[PDB]
Tab-separated table of C-alpha atoms and ligand atoms in Angstrom:
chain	number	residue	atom	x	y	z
A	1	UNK	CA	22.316	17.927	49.783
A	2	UNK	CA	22.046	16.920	46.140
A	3	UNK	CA	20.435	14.638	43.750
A	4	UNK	CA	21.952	11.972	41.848
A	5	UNK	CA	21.917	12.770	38.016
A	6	UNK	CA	19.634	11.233	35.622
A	7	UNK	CA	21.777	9.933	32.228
A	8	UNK	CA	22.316	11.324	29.144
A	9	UNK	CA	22.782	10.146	25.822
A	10	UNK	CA	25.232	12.482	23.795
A	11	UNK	CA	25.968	11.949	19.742
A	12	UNK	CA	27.913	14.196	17.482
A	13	UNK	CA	31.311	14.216	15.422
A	14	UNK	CA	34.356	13.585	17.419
A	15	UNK	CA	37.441	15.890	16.102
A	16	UNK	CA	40.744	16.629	17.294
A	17	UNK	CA	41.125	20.257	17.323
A	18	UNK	CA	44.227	21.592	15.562
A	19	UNK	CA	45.188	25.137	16.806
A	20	UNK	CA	46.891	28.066	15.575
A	21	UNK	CA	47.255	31.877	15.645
A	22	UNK	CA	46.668	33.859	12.410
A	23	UNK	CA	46.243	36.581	10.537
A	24	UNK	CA	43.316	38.020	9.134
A	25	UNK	CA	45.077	37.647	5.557
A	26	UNK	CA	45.356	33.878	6.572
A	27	UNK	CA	41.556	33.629	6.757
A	28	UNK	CA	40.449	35.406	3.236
A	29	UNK	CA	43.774	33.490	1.566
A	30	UNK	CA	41.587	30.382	2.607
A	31	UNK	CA	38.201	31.993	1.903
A	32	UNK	CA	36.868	31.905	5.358
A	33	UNK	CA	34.353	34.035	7.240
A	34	UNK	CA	36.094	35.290	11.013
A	35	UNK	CA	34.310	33.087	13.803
A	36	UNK	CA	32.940	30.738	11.587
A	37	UNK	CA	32.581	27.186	11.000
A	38	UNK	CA	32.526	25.291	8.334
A	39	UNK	CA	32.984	22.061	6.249
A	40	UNK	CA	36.528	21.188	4.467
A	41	UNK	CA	36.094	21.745	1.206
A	42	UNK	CA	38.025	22.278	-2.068
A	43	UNK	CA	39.053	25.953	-1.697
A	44	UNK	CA	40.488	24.784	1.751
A	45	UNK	CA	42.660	22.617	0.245
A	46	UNK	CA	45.684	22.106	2.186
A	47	UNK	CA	44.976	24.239	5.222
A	48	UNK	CA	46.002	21.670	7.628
A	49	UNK	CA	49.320	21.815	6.005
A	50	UNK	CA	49.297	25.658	6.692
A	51	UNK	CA	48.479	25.361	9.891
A	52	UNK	CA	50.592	22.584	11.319
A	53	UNK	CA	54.029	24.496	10.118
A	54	UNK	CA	53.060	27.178	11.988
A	55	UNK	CA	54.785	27.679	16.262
A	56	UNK	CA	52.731	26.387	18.903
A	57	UNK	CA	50.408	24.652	17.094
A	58	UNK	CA	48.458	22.511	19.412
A	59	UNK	CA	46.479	18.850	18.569
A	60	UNK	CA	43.671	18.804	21.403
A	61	UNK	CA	41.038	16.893	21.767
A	62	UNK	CA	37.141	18.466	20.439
A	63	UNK	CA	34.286	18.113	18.902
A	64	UNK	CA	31.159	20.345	19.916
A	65	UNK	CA	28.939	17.687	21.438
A	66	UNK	CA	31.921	16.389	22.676
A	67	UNK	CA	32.712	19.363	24.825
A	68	UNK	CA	29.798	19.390	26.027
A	69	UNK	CA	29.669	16.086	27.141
A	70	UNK	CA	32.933	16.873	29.497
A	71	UNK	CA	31.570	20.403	30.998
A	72	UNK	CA	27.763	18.225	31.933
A	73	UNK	CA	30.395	15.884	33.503
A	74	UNK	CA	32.836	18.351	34.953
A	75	UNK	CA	29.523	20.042	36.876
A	76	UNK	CA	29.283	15.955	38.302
A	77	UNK	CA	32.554	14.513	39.011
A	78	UNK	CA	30.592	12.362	41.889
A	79	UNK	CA	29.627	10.089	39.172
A	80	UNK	CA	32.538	9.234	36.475
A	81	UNK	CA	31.369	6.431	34.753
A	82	UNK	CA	27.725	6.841	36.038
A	83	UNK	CA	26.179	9.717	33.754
A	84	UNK	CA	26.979	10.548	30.106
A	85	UNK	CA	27.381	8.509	27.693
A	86	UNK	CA	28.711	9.698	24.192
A	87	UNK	CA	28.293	7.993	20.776
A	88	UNK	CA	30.380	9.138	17.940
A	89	UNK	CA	33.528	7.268	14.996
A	90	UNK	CA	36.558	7.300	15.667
A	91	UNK	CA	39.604	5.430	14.050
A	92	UNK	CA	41.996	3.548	16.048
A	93	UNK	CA	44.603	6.058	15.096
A	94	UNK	CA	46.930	8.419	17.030
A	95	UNK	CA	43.811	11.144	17.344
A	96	UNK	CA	41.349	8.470	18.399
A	97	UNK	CA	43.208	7.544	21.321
A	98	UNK	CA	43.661	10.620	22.690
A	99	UNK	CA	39.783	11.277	22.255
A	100	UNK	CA	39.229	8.490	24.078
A	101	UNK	CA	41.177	8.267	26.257
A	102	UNK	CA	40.945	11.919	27.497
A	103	UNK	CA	37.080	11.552	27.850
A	104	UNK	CA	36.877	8.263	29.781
A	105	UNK	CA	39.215	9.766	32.538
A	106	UNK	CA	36.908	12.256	32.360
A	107	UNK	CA	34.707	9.868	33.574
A	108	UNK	CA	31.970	9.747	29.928
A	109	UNK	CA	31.474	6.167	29.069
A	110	UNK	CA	33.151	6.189	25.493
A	111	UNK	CA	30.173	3.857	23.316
A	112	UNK	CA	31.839	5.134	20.106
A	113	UNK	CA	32.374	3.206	16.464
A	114	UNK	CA	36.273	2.279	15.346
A	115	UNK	CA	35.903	2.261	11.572
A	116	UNK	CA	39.189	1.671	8.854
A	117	UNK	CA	37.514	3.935	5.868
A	118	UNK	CA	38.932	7.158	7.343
A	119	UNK	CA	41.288	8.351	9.963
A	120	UNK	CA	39.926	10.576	12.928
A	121	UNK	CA	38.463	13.674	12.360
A	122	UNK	CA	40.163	16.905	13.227
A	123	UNK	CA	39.194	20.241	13.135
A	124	UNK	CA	41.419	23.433	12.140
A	125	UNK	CA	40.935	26.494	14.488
A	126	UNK	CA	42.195	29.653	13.104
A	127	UNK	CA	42.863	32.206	16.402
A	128	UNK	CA	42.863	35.883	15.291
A	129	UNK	CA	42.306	37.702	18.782
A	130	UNK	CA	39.612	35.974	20.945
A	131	UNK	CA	37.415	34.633	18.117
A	132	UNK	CA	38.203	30.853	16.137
A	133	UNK	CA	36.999	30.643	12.803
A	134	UNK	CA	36.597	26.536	11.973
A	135	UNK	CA	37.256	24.237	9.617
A	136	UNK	CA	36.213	20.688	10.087
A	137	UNK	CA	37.240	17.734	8.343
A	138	UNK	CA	35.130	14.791	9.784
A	139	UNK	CA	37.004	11.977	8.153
A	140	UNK	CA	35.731	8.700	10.187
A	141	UNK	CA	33.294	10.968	12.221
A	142	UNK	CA	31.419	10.538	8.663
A	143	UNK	CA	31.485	7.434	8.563
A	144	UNK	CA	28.962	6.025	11.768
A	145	UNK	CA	26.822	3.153	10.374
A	146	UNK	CA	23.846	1.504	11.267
A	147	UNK	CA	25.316	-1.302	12.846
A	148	UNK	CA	26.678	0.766	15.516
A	149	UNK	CA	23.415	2.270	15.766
A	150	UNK	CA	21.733	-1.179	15.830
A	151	UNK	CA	24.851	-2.737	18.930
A	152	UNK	CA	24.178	-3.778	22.385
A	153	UNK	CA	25.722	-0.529	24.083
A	154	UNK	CA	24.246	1.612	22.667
A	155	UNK	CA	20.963	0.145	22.571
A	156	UNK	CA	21.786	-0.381	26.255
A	157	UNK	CA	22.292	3.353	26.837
A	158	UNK	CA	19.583	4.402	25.062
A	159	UNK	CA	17.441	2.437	26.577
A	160	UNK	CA	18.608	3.777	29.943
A	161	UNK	CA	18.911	7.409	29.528
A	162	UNK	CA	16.056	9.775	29.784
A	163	UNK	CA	17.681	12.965	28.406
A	164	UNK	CA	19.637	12.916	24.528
A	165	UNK	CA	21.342	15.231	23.227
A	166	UNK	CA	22.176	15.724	19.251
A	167	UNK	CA	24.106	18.349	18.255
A	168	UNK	CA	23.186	19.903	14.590
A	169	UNK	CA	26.090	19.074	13.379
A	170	UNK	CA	25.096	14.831	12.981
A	171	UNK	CA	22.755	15.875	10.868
A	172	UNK	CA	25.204	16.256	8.340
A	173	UNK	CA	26.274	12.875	8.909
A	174	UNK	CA	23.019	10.690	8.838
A	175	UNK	CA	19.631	11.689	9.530
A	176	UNK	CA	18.570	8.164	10.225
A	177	UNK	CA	21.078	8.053	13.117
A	178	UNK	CA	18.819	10.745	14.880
A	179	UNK	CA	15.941	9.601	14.042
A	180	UNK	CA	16.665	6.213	15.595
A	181	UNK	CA	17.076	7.860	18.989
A	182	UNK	CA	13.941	10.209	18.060
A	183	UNK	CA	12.335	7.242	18.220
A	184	UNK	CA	14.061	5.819	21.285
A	185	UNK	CA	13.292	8.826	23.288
A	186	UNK	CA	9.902	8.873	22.338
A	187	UNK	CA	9.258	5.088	23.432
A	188	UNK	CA	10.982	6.086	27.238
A	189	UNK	CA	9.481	9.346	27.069
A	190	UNK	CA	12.685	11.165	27.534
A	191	UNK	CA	13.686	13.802	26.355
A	192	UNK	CA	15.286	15.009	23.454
A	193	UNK	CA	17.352	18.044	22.760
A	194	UNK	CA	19.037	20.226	19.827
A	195	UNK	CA	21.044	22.561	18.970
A	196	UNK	CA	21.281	24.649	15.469
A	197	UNK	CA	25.370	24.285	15.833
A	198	UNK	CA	26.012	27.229	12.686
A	199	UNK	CA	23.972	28.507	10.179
A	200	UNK	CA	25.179	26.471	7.248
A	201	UNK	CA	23.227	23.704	9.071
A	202	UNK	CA	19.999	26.037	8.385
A	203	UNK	CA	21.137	26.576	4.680
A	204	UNK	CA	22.028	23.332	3.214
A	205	UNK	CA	21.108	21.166	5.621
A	206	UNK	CA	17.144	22.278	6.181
A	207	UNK	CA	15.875	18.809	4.864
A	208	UNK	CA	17.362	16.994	7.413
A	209	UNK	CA	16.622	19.359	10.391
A	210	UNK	CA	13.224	19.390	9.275
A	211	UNK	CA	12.614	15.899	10.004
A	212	UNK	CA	14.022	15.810	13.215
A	213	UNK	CA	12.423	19.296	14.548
A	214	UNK	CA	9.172	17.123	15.389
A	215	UNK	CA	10.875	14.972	17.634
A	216	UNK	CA	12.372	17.789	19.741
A	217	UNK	CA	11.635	19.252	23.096
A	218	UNK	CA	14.105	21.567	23.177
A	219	UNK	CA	15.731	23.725	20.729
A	220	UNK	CA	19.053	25.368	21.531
A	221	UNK	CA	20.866	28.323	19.220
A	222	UNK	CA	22.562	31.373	19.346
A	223	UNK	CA	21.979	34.561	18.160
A	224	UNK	CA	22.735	34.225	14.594
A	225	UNK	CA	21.673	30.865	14.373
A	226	UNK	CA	18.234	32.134	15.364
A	227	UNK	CA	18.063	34.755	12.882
A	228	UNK	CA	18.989	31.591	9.958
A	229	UNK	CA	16.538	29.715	11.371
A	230	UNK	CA	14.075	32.478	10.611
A	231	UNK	CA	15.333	32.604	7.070
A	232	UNK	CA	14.952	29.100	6.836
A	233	UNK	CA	11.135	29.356	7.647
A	234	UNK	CA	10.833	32.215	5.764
A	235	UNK	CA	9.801	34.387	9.000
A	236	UNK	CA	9.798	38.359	8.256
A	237	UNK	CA	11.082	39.263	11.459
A	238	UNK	CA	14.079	41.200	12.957
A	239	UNK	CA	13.815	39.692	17.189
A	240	UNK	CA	15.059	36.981	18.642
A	241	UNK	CA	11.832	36.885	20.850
A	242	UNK	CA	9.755	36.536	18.016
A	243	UNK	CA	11.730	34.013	16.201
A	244	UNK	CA	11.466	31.868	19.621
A	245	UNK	CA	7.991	32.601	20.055
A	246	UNK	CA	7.364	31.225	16.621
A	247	UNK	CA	9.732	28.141	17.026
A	248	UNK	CA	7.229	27.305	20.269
A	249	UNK	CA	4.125	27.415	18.144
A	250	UNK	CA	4.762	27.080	14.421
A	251	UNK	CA	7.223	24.603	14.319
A	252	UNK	CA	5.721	21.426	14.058
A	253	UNK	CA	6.047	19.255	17.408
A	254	UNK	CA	4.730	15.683	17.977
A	255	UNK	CA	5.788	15.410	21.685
A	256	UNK	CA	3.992	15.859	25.088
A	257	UNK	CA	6.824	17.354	27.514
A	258	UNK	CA	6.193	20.458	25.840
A	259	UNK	CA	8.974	22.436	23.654
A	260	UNK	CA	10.874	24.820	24.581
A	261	UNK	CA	13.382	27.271	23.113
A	262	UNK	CA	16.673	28.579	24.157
A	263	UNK	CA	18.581	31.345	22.252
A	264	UNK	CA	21.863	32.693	23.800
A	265	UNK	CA	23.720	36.297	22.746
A	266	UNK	CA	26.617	36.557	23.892
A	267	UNK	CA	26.667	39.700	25.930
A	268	UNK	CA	22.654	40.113	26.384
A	269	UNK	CA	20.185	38.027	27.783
A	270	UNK	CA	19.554	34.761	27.281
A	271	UNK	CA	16.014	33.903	25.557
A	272	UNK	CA	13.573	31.095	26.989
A	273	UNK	CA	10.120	30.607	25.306
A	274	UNK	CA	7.427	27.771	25.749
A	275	UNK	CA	3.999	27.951	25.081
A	276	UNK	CA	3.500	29.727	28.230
A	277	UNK	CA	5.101	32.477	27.058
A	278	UNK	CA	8.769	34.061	26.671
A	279	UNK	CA	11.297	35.391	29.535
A	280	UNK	CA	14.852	36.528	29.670
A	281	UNK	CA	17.704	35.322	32.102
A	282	UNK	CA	20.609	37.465	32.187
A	283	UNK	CA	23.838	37.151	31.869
A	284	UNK	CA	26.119	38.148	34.762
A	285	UNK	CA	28.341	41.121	33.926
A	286	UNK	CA	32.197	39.943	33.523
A	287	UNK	CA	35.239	42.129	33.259
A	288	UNK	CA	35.630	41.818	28.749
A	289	UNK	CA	39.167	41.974	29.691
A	290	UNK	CA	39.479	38.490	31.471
A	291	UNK	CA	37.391	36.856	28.833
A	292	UNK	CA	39.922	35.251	26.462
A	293	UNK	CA	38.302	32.302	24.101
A	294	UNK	CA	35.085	33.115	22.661
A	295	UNK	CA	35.156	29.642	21.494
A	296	UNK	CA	33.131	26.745	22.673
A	297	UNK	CA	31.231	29.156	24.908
A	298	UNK	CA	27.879	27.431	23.407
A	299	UNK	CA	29.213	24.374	24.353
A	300	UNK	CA	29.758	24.873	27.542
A	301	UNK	CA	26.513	26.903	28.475
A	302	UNK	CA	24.874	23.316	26.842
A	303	UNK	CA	26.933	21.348	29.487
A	304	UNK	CA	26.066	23.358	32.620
A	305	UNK	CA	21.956	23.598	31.112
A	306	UNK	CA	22.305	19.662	30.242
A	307	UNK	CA	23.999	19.349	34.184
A	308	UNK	CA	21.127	21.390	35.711
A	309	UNK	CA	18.584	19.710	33.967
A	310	UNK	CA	19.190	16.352	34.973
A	311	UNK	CA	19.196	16.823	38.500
A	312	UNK	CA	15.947	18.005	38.533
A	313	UNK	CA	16.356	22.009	37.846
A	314	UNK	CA	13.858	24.408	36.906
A	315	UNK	CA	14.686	25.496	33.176
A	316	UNK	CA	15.548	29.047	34.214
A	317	UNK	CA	18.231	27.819	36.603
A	318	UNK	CA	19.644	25.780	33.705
A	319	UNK	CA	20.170	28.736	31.986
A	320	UNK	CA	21.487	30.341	34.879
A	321	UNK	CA	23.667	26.783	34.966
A	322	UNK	CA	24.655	27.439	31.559
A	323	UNK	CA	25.779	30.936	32.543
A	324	UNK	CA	28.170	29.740	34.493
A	325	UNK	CA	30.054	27.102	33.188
A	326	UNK	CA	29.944	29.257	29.585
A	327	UNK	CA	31.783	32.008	31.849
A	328	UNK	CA	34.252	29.713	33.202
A	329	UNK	CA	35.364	28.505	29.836
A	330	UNK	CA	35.949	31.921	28.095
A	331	UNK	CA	37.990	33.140	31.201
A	332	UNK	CA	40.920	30.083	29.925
A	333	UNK	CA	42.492	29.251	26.998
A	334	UNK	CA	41.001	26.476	25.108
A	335	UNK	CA	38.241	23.791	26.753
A	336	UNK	CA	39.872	24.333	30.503
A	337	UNK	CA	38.573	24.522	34.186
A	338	UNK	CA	39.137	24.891	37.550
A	339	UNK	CA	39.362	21.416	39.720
A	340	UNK	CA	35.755	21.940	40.925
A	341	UNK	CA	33.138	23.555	40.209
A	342	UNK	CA	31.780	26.660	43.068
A	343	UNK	CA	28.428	26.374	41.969
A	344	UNK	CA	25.551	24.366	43.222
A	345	UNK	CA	22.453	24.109	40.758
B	1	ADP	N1	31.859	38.091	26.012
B	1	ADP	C1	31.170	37.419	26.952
B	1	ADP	N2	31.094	37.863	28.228
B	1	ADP	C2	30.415	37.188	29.163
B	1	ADP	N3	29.784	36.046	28.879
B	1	ADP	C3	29.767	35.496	27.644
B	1	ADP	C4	30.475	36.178	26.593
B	1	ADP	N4	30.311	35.459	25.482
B	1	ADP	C5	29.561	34.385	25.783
B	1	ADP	N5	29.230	34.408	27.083
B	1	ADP	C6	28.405	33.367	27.766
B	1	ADP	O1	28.349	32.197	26.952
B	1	ADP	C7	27.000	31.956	26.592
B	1	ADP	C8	26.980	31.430	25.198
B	1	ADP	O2	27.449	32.503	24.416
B	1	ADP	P1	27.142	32.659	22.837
B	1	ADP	O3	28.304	33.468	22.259
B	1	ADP	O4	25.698	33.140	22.690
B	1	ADP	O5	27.297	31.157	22.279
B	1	ADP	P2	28.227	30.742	21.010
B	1	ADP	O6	29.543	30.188	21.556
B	1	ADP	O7	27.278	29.717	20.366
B	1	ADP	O8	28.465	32.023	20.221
B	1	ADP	C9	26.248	33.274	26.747
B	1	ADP	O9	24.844	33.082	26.963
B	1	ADP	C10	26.985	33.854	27.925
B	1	ADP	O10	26.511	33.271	29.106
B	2	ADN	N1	31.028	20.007	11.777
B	2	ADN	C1	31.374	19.787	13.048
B	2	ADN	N2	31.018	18.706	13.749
B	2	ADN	C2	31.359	18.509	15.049
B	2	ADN	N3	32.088	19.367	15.761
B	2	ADN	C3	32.484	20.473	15.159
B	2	ADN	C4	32.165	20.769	13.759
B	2	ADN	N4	32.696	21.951	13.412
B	2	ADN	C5	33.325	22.359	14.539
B	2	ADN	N5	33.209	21.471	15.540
B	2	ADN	C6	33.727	21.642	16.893
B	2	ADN	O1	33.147	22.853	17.348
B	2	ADN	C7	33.829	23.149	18.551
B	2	ADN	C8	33.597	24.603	18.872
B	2	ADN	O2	32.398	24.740	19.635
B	2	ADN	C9	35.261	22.776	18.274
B	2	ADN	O3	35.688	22.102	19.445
B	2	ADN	C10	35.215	21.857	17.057
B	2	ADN	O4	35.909	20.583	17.178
């Protein structure tokens, strides 16, 4: 006895995760931060190298907004084909095939930009225990143009979804890309959703996020994330309440659904705030010993929220959603899952 989902429009960077054990000498010889991500750059040079000589290395299809595109459909295998649709640039290269090709059998419809200027994006994950630390090298992923923007599917699919969901991440890409679908979402009155994605995004990217932030209904972080986001805005404050409390009312917002503000933490209780006020949902208590990946775990709590919310759910329950499909995730190495889900939203 269940509805039929409402779609949703997904963009971000599609990367091809390149994986590795390591040791914490590996991470400072490389200048990194443990469970981090960041952006290629000069003092990384040649870290893919590194990486690739290593045993067991494994090439595996990523990207966060990615990820969460497959765990929204994963929670709604009755409708392959009929529910997500993700928008990102590829190349037609060995890594953009198996992007592609591992999503569509996943059953997202695939609306994503070939370009020649760069090959497909990949991602080095440094393992050191259960945390990643991340190093992304977008190659074509930085490359999605206007025309792409401006084509007949993805028109199409904007036209026809009612929920989108950017990840912070494209907003080092091209803020005009989000503020197209802004704009979209705005003339369907959908709905359109964010999340903060790693605090670099609040340090060098604030511009950008600060032109998009009165477009959006709902803002998604973590912990850390949330306490950035506070520096950003130059809040004095210590809580994660606060900070959401603030985000509800001080924020600038432009839309009529009404915003809303999700910050996870790990362990603790997840934060909800509107402007009726701010509640907890908790998280339910897991064994630390059979969680294994701490990685992704925001992506996949945005899948099973994203799932939840377009059949219909209450927002709590997509937390509660999110809850579960995050658990599921840390409890197996790398993006993995059971056949079916044994939860009903
Ligand atoms: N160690 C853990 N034990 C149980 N659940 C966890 C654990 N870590 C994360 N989760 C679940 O995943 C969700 C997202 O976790 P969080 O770490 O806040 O996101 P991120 O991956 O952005 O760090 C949490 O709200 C929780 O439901
Ligand atoms: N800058 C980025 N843009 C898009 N995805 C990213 C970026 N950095 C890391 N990721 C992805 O984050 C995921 C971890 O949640 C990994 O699957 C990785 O591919």
């Amino acid at each position: 006895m269940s509805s039929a989902p409402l779609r949703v429009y997904v963009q971000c960077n599609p990367l091809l995760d390149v994986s590795a054990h390591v040791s914490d000498e590996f991470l400072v010889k490389y200048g990194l931060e443990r469970g981090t991500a960041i952006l290629l750059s000069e003092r990384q040079k040649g870290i893919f190298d590194d990486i690739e000589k290593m045993p067991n290395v494994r090439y595996v299809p990523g990207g966060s907004g990615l990820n969460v595109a497959r765990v929204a459909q994963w929670m709604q295998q009755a409708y392959k084909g009929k529910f997500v649709t993700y928008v990102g640039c590829i190349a037609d290269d060995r890594y953009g095939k198996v992007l592609k090709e591992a999503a569509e059998h996943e059953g997202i419809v695939m609306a994503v930009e070939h370009t020649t200027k760069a090959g497909s994006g990949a991602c080095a994950v440094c393992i050191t225990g259960k945390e990643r630390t991340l190093v992304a090298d977008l190659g074509a992923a930085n490359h999605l143009s206007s025309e792409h923007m401006r084509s007949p599917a993805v028109v199409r699919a904007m036209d026809e979804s009612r929920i989108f969901y950017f990840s912070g991440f494209t907003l080092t890409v091209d803020v005009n890309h989000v503020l197209q679908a802004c704009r979209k979402a705005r003339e369907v009155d959908g709905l359109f959703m964010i999340n903060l994605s790693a605090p670099f995004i609040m340090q060098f990217f604030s511009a950008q996020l600060g032109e998009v932030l009165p477009y959006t209904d709902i803002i998604v972080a973590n912990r850390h994330e949330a306490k950035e986001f506070a520096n950003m805005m130059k809040w004095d404050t210590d809580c994660v309440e606060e900070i959401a409390r603030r985000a509800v009312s001080e924020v600038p917002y432009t839309g009529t659904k009404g915003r809303v503000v999700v910050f996870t933490r790990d362990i603790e209780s997840t934060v909800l705030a509107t402007k009726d006020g701010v509640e907890t949902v908790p998280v339910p208590q897991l064994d630390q010993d059979k969680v294994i990946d701490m990685n992704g775990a925001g992506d996949a709590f945005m899948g099973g929220f994203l799932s939840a919310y377009a059949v219909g759910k209450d927002l709590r329950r997509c937390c509660e959603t999110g809850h579960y499909t995050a658990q599921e995730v840390i409890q197996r190495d790398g993006c993995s899952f059971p056949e079916k889900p044994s939860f009903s939203p």
